[PDB]
Amino acid sequence: HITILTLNINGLNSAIKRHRLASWIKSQDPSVCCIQETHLTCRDTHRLKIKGWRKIYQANGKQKKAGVAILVSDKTDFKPTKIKRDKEGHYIMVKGSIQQEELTILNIYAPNTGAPRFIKQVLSDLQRDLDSHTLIMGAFNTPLSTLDRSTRQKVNKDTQELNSALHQADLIDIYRTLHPKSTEYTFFSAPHHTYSKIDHIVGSKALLSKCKRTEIITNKLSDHSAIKLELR
DNA sequence: GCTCCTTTTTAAGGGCTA
DNA sequence: AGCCCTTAAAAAGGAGC
Secondary structure: OOEEEEEEOOOOOOHHHHHHHHHHHHHHOOOEEEEEOOOOEOOOHHHOOEOOEOEEEEEOEOOOOOOEEEEEOOOOOEOOOEEEEOOOOOEEEEEEEEOOOEEEEEEEEOOOOOHHHHHHHHHHHOHHHOOOOEEEEEEOOOOOOHHHEOOOOOOOOOHHHHHHHHHOOOEEEHHHHHOOOOOOOOEEEOOOOEEEOOEEEEEEHHHHHHOOEEEEEOOOOOOEOEEEEEOO
């Protein structure tokens, strides 16, 4: 087994913060790490350098906003076959073979204003590469179930609009499926003293066979928590 | 270099018109 | 049913030592 990690880092333009991210990731030791909200521009990708993770695939915009990265451990032979990247910086997709078992990874950062519905259209734009071995991860900035929110408000209609799009592509929320009754959160809103789980691991139903654990990890690096997934 | 203050950015209720 | 303005606290920016 292989480990997948998701973290909304909330800005990486500080050099001290890049150092702390480097040390945290070596601490966690994932096989693949997905970072959202790096805030690195198109010409600033080489500032992001972790030792032990030399394959670092990025999609960036032109402003110190958005930005996604997929980091691949040096301890796994990951031989990539396709790389599609938005040049606004909101998603990157990587297909390859970790431990020679095929896999697709889509790393998405949805803007909070109109989030679930940017995600629906992103799935439709990358339709033709979506498989039976996908993981979708990142800052969805939307809850998917009423359990993803401390106010427990009923779900947006357009989240039911995405849940259909996930279910018609045979994808499930991996975290919810392994903990259908669990309330643990990835974001605390200090202005409202609310909690929410707006960051997600979504995956092919077919790979649910292969998933052992999914953890929510506290950290001193960002105002979001991280999601860890050990596969098999 | 460095310290310290100012401005921007971001997720989310809570009120309320088309 | 969905938008606008506000909120707090960090990220990004900048004046001045």
